[PDB]
Amino acid sequence: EVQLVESGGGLVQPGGSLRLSCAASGFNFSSSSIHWVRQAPGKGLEWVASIYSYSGYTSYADSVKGRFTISADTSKNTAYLQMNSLRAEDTAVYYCARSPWRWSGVSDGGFYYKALDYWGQGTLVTVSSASTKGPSVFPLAPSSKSTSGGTAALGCLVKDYFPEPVTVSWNSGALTSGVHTFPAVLQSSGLYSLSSVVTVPSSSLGTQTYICNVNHKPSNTKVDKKV
Amino acid sequence: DIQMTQSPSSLSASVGDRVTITCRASQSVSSAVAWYQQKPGKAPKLLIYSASSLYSGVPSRFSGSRSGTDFTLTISSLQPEDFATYYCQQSSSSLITFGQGTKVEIKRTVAAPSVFIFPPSDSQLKSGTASVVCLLNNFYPREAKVQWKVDNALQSGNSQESVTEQDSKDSTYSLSSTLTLSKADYEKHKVYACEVTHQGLSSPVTKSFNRGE
Amino acid sequence: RSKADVERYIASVQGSTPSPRQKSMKGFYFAKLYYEAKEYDLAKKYICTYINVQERDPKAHRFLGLLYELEENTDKAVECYRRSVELNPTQKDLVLKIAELLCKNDVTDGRAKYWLERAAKLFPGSPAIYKLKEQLLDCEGEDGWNKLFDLIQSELYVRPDDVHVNIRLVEVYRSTKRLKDAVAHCHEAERNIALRSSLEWNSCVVQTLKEYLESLQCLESDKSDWRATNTDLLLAYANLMLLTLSTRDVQESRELLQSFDSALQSVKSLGGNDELSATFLEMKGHFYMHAGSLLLKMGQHSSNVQWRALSELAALCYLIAFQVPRPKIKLIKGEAGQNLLEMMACDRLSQSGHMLLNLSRGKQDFLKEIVETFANKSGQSALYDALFSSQSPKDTSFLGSDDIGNIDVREPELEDLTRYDVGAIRAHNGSLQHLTWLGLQWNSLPALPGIRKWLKQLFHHLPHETSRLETNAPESICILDLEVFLLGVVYTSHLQLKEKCNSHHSSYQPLCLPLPVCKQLCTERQKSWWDAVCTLIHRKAVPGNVAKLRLLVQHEINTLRAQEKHGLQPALLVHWAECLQKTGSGLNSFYDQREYMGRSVHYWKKVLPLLKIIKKKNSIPEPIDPLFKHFHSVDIQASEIVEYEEDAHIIFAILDAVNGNIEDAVTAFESIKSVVSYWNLALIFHRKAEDIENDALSPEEQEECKNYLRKTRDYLIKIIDDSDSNLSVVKKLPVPLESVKEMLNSVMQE
């Protein structure tokens, strides 16, 4: 019955602004301290803002001080993270969470919170001046003639797309096992790129038609590519 | 500024082991530390609060302890469901800081990566770029080092790589290395070699291709 | 002397020299006696008129400067001295004064330096001269002024509700003479709900705005935003008027009315169809409403003959206000602005409404007479007479020029009043003063207010009842606790005032007091609690004081729940029980019904032990510093015990039925032939019938199902038969009569 819902995310251009909404239900919003904790891809948890339980004095990390503004509304029973002057560095998954007054102690020189009990699902925020774009698929077939005994390796290169995510399947899901699709990397240009590969018996190469099916929903792109 | 230094960064263990993770506070900090479990992509969950008090609902095999400025999470008997990343957190005056995190990887025997190099495709050369791919498949452990040779010449600062998470069936990883530069520079060299070093390899191994085969 | 001695001399010289020129040439000698009778808003206008005909008299001009000095209006006082000085150079002491005041207010302008040089040569090396030399140096530099500004801003960041700090910001803006920024912050701050309720802030708002209107900067910049700022002045006047009436004395309130009326006359001419015009509409209503309250304040202290005549006059004022339509909310630029204006609209209709009723309850169709007799323009002059001194020009006074056309003379409908109250709960920041008044105003009416809806408008998403009822920690506060609280605050307040008027003797008129005039109606203890829980919930507390605020609330919880050492007289508990039963018994949903019924059973279960001791004529252990004052006025008597035991036993059965103990509930329900038990018996027989009524099922069972629907029909009929016959039973209905008939129509067509 108790949950936290994050909303108000999505992509934005650098130097822009966004506003996140952390909707709470099931616990008295007045006596809870609200926090926001972002996490870039493959990175750790970073505390970015806090709101003392019963009053709402702000406190920010120096990496965002003065730019972000966190607020709490009793009537709407919801907290928000106003973000300004957004930089590419702020691209990260933003979570919110509460800490009851039972865990909120005030001391000389600042306040402390014992732990974060309730967390949200986490809403994604991407910051990149690169504009949306569909993927270009370049095949990666085996220049091997039964190199590794009975098995050979083929793959597909999904490149020059923005933003994450892309989804891939082989033979429209017929070739399920043996596949490994790697995370994407931010090319300095601004577009992401990844690879998808699968190991298949060389004796069957040339008999079973192998096709990778990529779907980039953010740009409404669908491409099937044979190898 | 207060800092929470978490150690180790990446841990490898098997089921039933008694595992330990530790965080050191730079300045003398009071018992206002917490511990969290974060499974890949999901939200972090609270394990221990106020240093040694267990959060209601957390299994009893977890226990927190402190000694001086070093805080320690202790799992009495590791379980399969505990193979995730963990974080330590201090709450000082009007500030919260987290540890760098600790990944708990499932331990297994060593495996040698079956490497396969792949050239840039005809379609990619049409666009004006050239990407070479070097696969490292189903190996263990995570630690490995790959190097690129253009006509037997080292290359750095122009290629990147990414690694899969520990597979569920065999507990092995995979790595994809990408060497990216213009078609013009690709037509300037003939030989291309991808070298791999790994604890599972008796000796370093290399595979190569020649433009035009 | 007094007020009569000086305003009676008006008719003495009015009958000796009636022409306008000689009437104004006596202004200086008129103002001569008001300065002695402590009338400074009045003496100002008398002398100012003599100055309109004798503009070259150095004595009169100085006297106004000395009067503006008492008013502390530095900019106005200085100019007056200047005129007396330029007319007559021999007034050395005034050259000192000008130099003294110019150096004290602001040194940035060289004019303070110039007048100081002259002051020196008139009084060579006098002791004051150096004093002024040090004063001029005192003021800080550019880096120093910016330094002070940064403190206030950093201070306002964490303390935006601090009255003094925001005031200082306006004073600092005004000190650097960037008034446009002063009003800008002044405008953006009238959206703050806390500041709008602050008497001193609104007063500052009136000045900083007026200063800008006359300011050179207002004209030069543009005349587009001129209207926008003008709206805020009217808003400030309304808020300032509401507050001044309650705290300040008779004299100060009347003086503020004149500033209000002057502004209105200056605004009506522009008209138009924008926020200002819509604002003028709503503010127009407030004027009469407050004006009516002002009238009643004077009469309260006075004799009976003036009381009736003044209340008659006030009744017309409130009526005018009520007639005024709801302002055009859509026409405003923003949601905050428009919501505020409507909030005030609800406040106007609510306060004037209840006043209109309580004054009309005195006699039969008392309202009709008021209109037929004073709606006449003759009343317009009789109103202007009682409120103001007739000497002020009746031309530029909005009151004398208003078109009183087609006064509705229709008493208000309760249903409309409820929705007015509910919408204006946030009008005065939910001060327990505000709510305790409304709750008392409905105490004389036959329909009760939706308190639970009031609380929902203030503390949104506050659960009706908290799961963790076991402890008294104040994180478990529930809308029930507040509803239970307000009930006692009003039940307590009524009895305290009842005791008071018994002591006052004189003429008995307890219902008639208006909201501003009356003093605190709750105990400072009770008020402290409400102020605490409010600041806590809305998240406007202080990290340091959190623990204190938190504990202050905790102290009283054990009493709101009738726990260990509850300071609760048995009568107050009973009042809570039935007041919650009937409040809950009319609700539609099961969640709320259960909750309100549960608490009712709780309080019932706590009283019955007490009633048994009282039933045998024993003594109740009186409390120790109770939270809700005990009274022997309402001490419970033996005559009513057996009914409550009956009324309580129904509550038990009802809960038994809701829990599932139909067998014990029915066995009990049939035992008591009560109107309410019919509606319960019927409602549960109807459900057993409706579910089983249409599915394919054993035929014998279907007849038994029908048999219950037959019982349902009979009990609803017993309700209506006994209802139409006797009125007392109609009031016992747990739901409206038409609701019982509504079900019956559907029941029989089934």
mmCIF file with all atom_site columns, C-alpha atoms in Angstrom, chain A residues 28-34 51-58 60 69 72 74-77 100-102 106 111, chain C residues 157-159 426 458-463 468 474-476 535-544 546-547 550:
data_model
loop_
_atom_site.group_PDB
_atom_site.id
_atom_site.type_symbol
_atom_site.label_atom_id
_atom_site.label_alt_id
_atom_site.label_comp_id
_atom_site.label_asym_id
_atom_site.label_entity_id
_atom_site.label_seq_id
_atom_site.pdbx_PDB_ins_code
_atom_site.Cartn_x
_atom_site.Cartn_y
_atom_site.Cartn_z
_atom_site.occupancy
_atom_site.B_iso_or_equiv
_atom_site.pdbx_formal_charge
_atom_site.auth_seq_id
_atom_site.auth_comp_id
_atom_site.auth_asym_id
_atom_site.auth_atom_id
_atom_site.pdbx_PDB_model_num
ATOM 1  C CA . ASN A 1 28  ? 2.431  10.705 6.482  1.00 0.00 ? 28  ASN A CA 1
ATOM 2  C CA . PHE A 1 29  ? 4.323  12.991 4.097  1.00 0.00 ? 29  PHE A CA 1
ATOM 3  C CA . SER A 1 30  ? 4.800  15.676 6.767  1.00 0.00 ? 30  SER A CA 1
ATOM 4  C CA . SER A 1 31  ? 7.031  13.647 9.102  1.00 0.00 ? 31  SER A CA 1
ATOM 5  C CA . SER A 1 32  ? 9.222  12.149 6.344  1.00 0.00 ? 32  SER A CA 1
ATOM 6  C CA . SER A 1 33  ? 12.466 13.589 4.997  1.00 0.00 ? 33  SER A CA 1
ATOM 7  C CA . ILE A 1 34  ? 12.797 13.351 1.218  1.00 0.00 ? 34  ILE A CA 1
ATOM 8  C CA . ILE A 1 51  ? 14.636 17.997 2.769  1.00 0.00 ? 51  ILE A CA 1
ATOM 9  C CA . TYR A 1 52  ? 14.427 17.873 6.558  1.00 0.00 ? 52  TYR A CA 1
ATOM 10 C CA . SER A 1 53  ? 11.389 16.009 7.799  1.00 0.00 ? 53  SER A CA 1
ATOM 11 C CA . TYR A 1 54  ? 9.113  18.531 9.485  1.00 0.00 ? 54  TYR A CA 1
ATOM 12 C CA . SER A 1 55  ? 10.309 21.870 8.077  1.00 0.00 ? 55  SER A CA 1
ATOM 13 C CA . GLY A 1 56  ? 12.082 21.452 4.766  1.00 0.00 ? 56  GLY A CA 1
ATOM 14 C CA . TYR A 1 57  ? 15.478 23.102 4.972  1.00 0.00 ? 57  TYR A CA 1
ATOM 15 C CA . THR A 1 58  ? 17.412 22.295 1.820  1.00 0.00 ? 58  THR A CA 1
ATOM 16 C CA . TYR A 1 60  ? 22.674 20.021 -1.807 1.00 0.00 ? 60  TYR A CA 1
ATOM 17 C CA . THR A 1 69  ? 16.047 23.013 -6.177 1.00 0.00 ? 69  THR A CA 1
ATOM 18 C CA . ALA A 1 72  ? 7.857  19.426 -0.951 1.00 0.00 ? 72  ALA A CA 1
ATOM 19 C CA . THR A 1 74  ? 1.847  18.963 1.684  1.00 0.00 ? 74  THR A CA 1
ATOM 20 C CA . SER A 1 75  ? -1.390 19.535 -0.226 1.00 0.00 ? 75  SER A CA 1
ATOM 21 C CA . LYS A 1 76  ? -0.226 17.410 -3.170 1.00 0.00 ? 76  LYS A CA 1
ATOM 22 C CA . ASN A 1 77  ? 1.663  14.913 -0.965 1.00 0.00 ? 77  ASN A CA 1
ATOM 23 C CA . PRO A 1 100 ? 11.142 9.112  8.884  1.00 0.00 ? 100 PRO A CA 1
ATOM 24 C CA . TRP A 1 101 ? 11.515 11.616 11.699 1.00 0.00 ? 101 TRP A CA 1
ATOM 25 C CA . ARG A 1 102 ? 12.389 8.560  13.784 1.00 0.00 ? 102 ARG A CA 1
ATOM 26 C CA . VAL A 1 106 ? 19.152 17.525 14.103 1.00 0.00 ? 106 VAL A CA 1
ATOM 27 C CA . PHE A 1 111 ? 21.410 17.310 10.401 1.00 0.00 ? 111 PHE A CA 1
ATOM 28 C CA . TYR C 2 157 ? 16.081 32.020 1.748  1.00 0.00 ? 157 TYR C CA 1
ATOM 29 C CA . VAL C 2 158 ? 15.469 29.844 4.812  1.00 0.00 ? 158 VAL C CA 1
ATOM 30 C CA . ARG C 2 159 ? 12.947 32.164 6.561  1.00 0.00 ? 159 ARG C CA 1
ATOM 31 C CA . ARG C 2 426 ? -7.778 28.783 3.854  1.00 0.00 ? 426 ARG C CA 1
ATOM 32 C CA . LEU C 2 458 ? -6.490 22.083 5.155  1.00 0.00 ? 458 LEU C CA 1
ATOM 33 C CA . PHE C 2 459 ? -4.525 18.882 5.724  1.00 0.00 ? 459 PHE C CA 1
ATOM 34 C CA . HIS C 2 460 ? -4.789 17.062 2.410  1.00 0.00 ? 460 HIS C CA 1
ATOM 35 C CA . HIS C 2 461 ? -4.221 13.301 2.327  1.00 0.00 ? 461 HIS C CA 1
ATOM 36 C CA . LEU C 2 462 ? -4.336 13.131 6.114  1.00 0.00 ? 462 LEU C CA 1
ATOM 37 C CA . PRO C 2 463 ? -5.937 9.726  6.794  1.00 0.00 ? 463 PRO C CA 1
ATOM 38 C CA . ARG C 2 468 ? -0.975 2.746  14.580 1.00 0.00 ? 468 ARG C CA 1
ATOM 39 C CA . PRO C 2 474 ? 2.087  12.735 16.958 1.00 0.00 ? 474 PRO C CA 1
ATOM 40 C CA . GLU C 2 475 ? 3.065  11.173 13.632 1.00 0.00 ? 475 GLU C CA 1
ATOM 41 C CA . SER C 2 476 ? -0.192 9.167  13.979 1.00 0.00 ? 476 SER C CA 1
ATOM 42 C CA . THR C 2 535 ? 3.032  24.339 11.221 1.00 0.00 ? 535 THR C CA 1
ATOM 43 C CA . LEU C 2 536 ? 4.122  20.708 11.564 1.00 0.00 ? 536 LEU C CA 1
ATOM 44 C CA . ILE C 2 537 ? 1.795  19.293 8.898  1.00 0.00 ? 537 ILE C CA 1
ATOM 45 C CA . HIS C 2 538 ? 2.296  22.026 6.302  1.00 0.00 ? 538 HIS C CA 1
ATOM 46 C CA . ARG C 2 539 ? 6.081  21.616 6.794  1.00 0.00 ? 539 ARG C CA 1
ATOM 47 C CA . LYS C 2 540 ? 6.742  25.149 8.018  1.00 0.00 ? 540 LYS C CA 1
ATOM 48 C CA . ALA C 2 541 ? 8.282  24.213 11.379 1.00 0.00 ? 541 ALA C CA 1
ATOM 49 C CA . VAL C 2 542 ? 11.897 24.715 12.516 1.00 0.00 ? 542 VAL C CA 1
ATOM 50 C CA . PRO C 2 543 ? 14.458 21.830 12.692 1.00 0.00 ? 543 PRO C CA 1
ATOM 51 C CA . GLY C 2 544 ? 15.451 22.940 16.177 1.00 0.00 ? 544 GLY C CA 1
ATOM 52 C CA . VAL C 2 546 ? 10.738 20.186 15.694 1.00 0.00 ? 546 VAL C CA 1
ATOM 53 C CA . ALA C 2 547 ? 11.242 18.142 18.835 1.00 0.00 ? 547 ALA C CA 1
ATOM 54 C CA . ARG C 2 550 ? 6.395  17.478 18.246 1.00 0.00 ? 550 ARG C CA 1
#
